[PDB]
């Protein structure tokens, strides 16, 4: 249910109804997420979409948000925790 397209993620990762575009996903859960030329290293996003942006933890937790160029979208149902982001 992992949709990939030019995209990498480390044997340890896990990819569920989600979307990878261009991304690379290195230790992370990724559930319901649509991911575009994005890095994920260590964290678990969950029902969000990322787009050309860089997101570490490895405590990072992500629900429900939009992450841009490494912002995060202002938004009352975004939650985000010991995450770090960067522009990619």
Do not use: H, M, W
Not at 35 to 47: A, E, L, W
Request: proline share 3%.
């Amino acid at each position: 249910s992992c949709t990939n397209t030019n995209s990498q993620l480390s044997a340890n990762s896990k990819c569920e109804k989600s979307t990878l575009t261009n991304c690379y996903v290195d230790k992370s859960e990724v559930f319901g997420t649509t991911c575009t030329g994005s890095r994920f290293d260590g964290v678990t996003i969950t029902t969000s979409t990322s787009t050309g942006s860089r997101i570490s933890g490895p405590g990072c937790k992500i629900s429900t948000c939009i992450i841009t160029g490494g912002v995060p979208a202002p938004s009352a149902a975004c939650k985000i925790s010991g995450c770090t982001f960067s522009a990619n």
